[PDB]
Amino acid sequence: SRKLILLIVFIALLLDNMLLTVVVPIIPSYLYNENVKVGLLFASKATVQLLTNPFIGPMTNRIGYQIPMFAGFCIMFVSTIMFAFSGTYTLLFIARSLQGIGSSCSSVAGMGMLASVYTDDEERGNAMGVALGGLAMGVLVGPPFGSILYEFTAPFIVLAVLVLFDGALQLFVLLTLIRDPYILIAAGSICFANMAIAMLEPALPIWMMETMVAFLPASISYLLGTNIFGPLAHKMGRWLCAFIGMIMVGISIICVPFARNIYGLIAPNFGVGFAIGMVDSSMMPIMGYLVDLRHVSVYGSVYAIADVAFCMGFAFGPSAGGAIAKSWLMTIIGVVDILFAPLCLFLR
């Protein structure tokens, strides 16, 4: 009976990630400082998520999480269809903002409900690793499915008919500020670990073009690592797992950029994806453990902070891409990550 909530969270996360990733190959200018607006097109979702999550945080504790879940389903259902008839780019920006706030609400409600239903550490870790694996599956299957169905209304009909079953199942089933660094360390670690891939995402096509599917190895590694290295981390402490993951991602990021040939350039992305997935999966339940240590037993605000840290990198990663490219390696994030790694060496 308890696995129904996990299934609902899985479906919601997969749906949100699939909707997010389908926008990558198709652009409003493609279908017909322009690149600045193109970047803003996908930056708007992250910015509105960051702006909206903290305000909708405490409402979960004030009222509940099932009603926010139903509202997230409703807003997703009313927002997805609008992509079918798009007139102007500003309408696309508005649709992106609505989808972003809906995804934020759905994710926070799902994480809160999943944290509240299970009070056991290893089961909680397994459930959240399953959620992360579902996110990985969605981000992996988005682009190819969208690309193949673009040729064979048509681009989004499958999603429009898929949301219906999830909505029907969901319908049928029915202190703000912290000065403690013990959560801030995890927030910063996950923020930088996500900022690494956020910065790596747009820079690679520049090298590909100047040297004459890029994120597929990374997604494959993420999916094949998260679910397989999640549960085993409970056997021992979180020190070694997080430290090794941070060291691995730092080494991979430092070694990836320079490449004499491009055929083997995709191989380091496997290491990057494995490292980011391992770090995220290992670090996710530590916040819940700290909440259990804390007097407050409501996980809504801490998971809201976690999501804010998750989306901080997506907010303005590619904002300074051209300036960084014009600007000794162009990427130095690995050094920052490795020097910040020993901060989380000691844990309760």
Numbering used by the authors: 18 to 49, 125 to 244, 248 to 269, 285 to 322, 331 to 445, 450 to 470
From the paper:
Vesicular monoamine transporter 2 (VMAT2) is responsible for H+-dependent uptake of monoamine neurotransmitters, e.g. dopamine (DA) and serotonin (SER), from the cytoplasm to presynaptic vesicles in monoaminergic neurons. Vesicular monoamine transporter 2 (VMAT2) belongs to the major facilitator superfamily (MFS), and mediates cytoplasmic monoamine packaging into presynaptic vesicles. Substrates bind to MFS transporters between N-domain and C-domain, and are transported by a rocker-switch alternating access mechanism. In this work, we report two cryo-EM structures of VMAT2, with VMAT2 from Xenopus laevis adopting a canonical MFS fold and an engineered VMAT2 from Ovis aries adopting a non-canonical fold.
Eventually, the structure of XlVMAT2WT was determined at 4.0 Å resolution after extensive data collection and processing. A total of 348 out of 514 residues were traced in the XlVMAT2WT structure, including all 12 TM helices and several connecting loops. Intriguingly, comparison to the hMCT2 structure revealed that the XlVMAT2WT structure adopts a canonical MFS fold. Unlike OaVMAT2TM8/9-BRIL, N- and C-domains of XlVMAT2WT are structurally similar, and could be superimposed with a Cα RMSD of 2.5 Å. The XlVMAT2WT structure was solved in an apo, lumen-facing open conformation with a large, deep cavity. Serotonin was placed in a pocket between TM5, TM7, TM8, TM10 and TM11 near the center of XlVMAT2WT. Meanwhile, the hydroxyl group of serotonin forms a hydrogen bond with the side chain of E311 (TM7), and its amine group interacts with side chains of N304 (TM7) and D398 (TM10) via a hydrogen bond and a salt bridge, respectively. Meanwhile, purified XlVMAT2WT showed reasonable binding affinities for substrates dopamine (Kd = 1.13 ± 0.52 μM) and serotonin (Kd = 0.43 ± 0.22 μM), and for the inhibitor reserpine (Kd = 17.0 ± 8.8 nM). The non-canonical structure of OaVMAT2TM8/9-BRIL forms a dimer, whereas the canonical structure of XlVMAT2WT is a monomer.
